[PDB]
Amino acid sequence: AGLYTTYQLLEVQRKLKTLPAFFLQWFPRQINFQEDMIAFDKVIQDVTRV
Amino acid sequence: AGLYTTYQLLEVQRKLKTLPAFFLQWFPRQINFQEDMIAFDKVIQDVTRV
């Protein structure tokens, strides 16, 4: 004391919230492209006929 | 873009319908005959009589 109260310091309590990955388990593939759009093709192939 | 866009194509999504063999599993014997017809004989012998 006197001019100023003396202190001891203890360890700093650092909480660190995260947002852990859950829905990215269903998105396995990473495909990069330097192009404008991404197109797909869906094709239904009717086979089961006598 | 400009005149028209560019495209990165991913894999073709092929919906394909089959009809797997459930009834053929009781028909094991295969006969590749060149003749006309196929003759069977069935014989029932009644013995259980007094």
Alpha-carbon radius of gyration of chain B: 30
Distance from C-alpha of A15 to C-alpha of B13, rounded to nearest angstrom: 46
Chain-chain contact of B7 with A44 (C-beta, under 8 angstroms): no
Measured in angstroms, the resolution is 3.8
- What is the DSSP code string of A1-45? --SS-----------------SGGGS-------SSSEEE--EEEE
Tokens 């869906």 belong to residue? A42
- What is the DSSP code string of B6-18? -EEE---EEEE--
The technique by which this structure was obtained is: cryo-EM
> What residues in B contact A35, CB-CB < 8 Å?
6-8
Q: Which of A31, A36, A44 sits opposite B7 (nearest CB)?
A: A36
**C-alpha torsion B19→B23→B27→B33, nearest 10:** -50
Cα first-last separation, chain A: 99
Distance from C-alpha of B6 to C-alpha of B11, rounded to nearest angstrom: 17
